[PDB]
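User: Could you go from structure to sequence for me? I need the amino acid at each position, not a summary. Structure tokens:
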């Protein structure tokens, strides 16, 4: 499994690895299976929405009983199971069915388009809104309730990554 076999990053928490599961623009929700290391179709979203970001996980992280999720803003979406060196710039805070389900927002290190993106204030506000709204509504036809706490900055993101990396060490 890229989850188990890779280190969290080449320079955590400044640069992490993101293992991409879902390319920006997919209505199919793919997940990396931790045991087999293969891509699985978790579900087809019940509504005609698409993932607004390249969506994945950081290797060797464990969060709150799952890998820590990362959203990577890519101009051209990558293929599932691509590794991206990503810079954390933000932290999305939502709770899904009582459980905290925070997500890191990151930019690709090797796309110079995002070179001056270093914190949440560098992101177009309507983009942060479109992400929050996606997670607020995407499971509404499945009867789930997601509460969205909002966003925090890069420093918070990076704390939470270091925290999830040690939680992985405790569990494995």
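Assistant: Here is the amino acid at each position, in order:
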């Amino acid at each position: 499994n890229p989850f188990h076999d890779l280190e969290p990053g080449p320079d955590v928490p400044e640069v992490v690895y993101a293992i991409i599961e879902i390319p920006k623009g997919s209505r199919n929700k793919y997940e990396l299976d931790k045991k087999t290391g293969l891509l699985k179709l978790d579900r087809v979203l019940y509504s005609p929405f698409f993932y607004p970001v390249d969506y994945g996980i950081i290797p060797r992280t464990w969060y709150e009983d799952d890998p820590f999720d990362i959203m990577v803003i890519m101009r051209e979406p990558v293929y599932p199971l691509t590794i991206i060196e990503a810079r954390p710039i933000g932290l999305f805070k939502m709770i899904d069915s009582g459980d905290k389900d925070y997500k890191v927002l990151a930019v690709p290190v090797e796309d110079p388009y995002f070179k001056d993106w270093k914190d949440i204030d560098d992101v177009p506000k309507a983009f942060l809104d479109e992400i929050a709204h996606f997670f607020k509504r995407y499971k509404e036809l499945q009867g789930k309730e997601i509460i969205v706490e909002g966003w925090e900055g890069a420093e918070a993101a990076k704390r939470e990554i270091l925290r999830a990396i040690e939680m992985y060490k405790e569990k494995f």
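One structural detail worth keeping in mind: The two ends are 14 Å apart (CA to CA).
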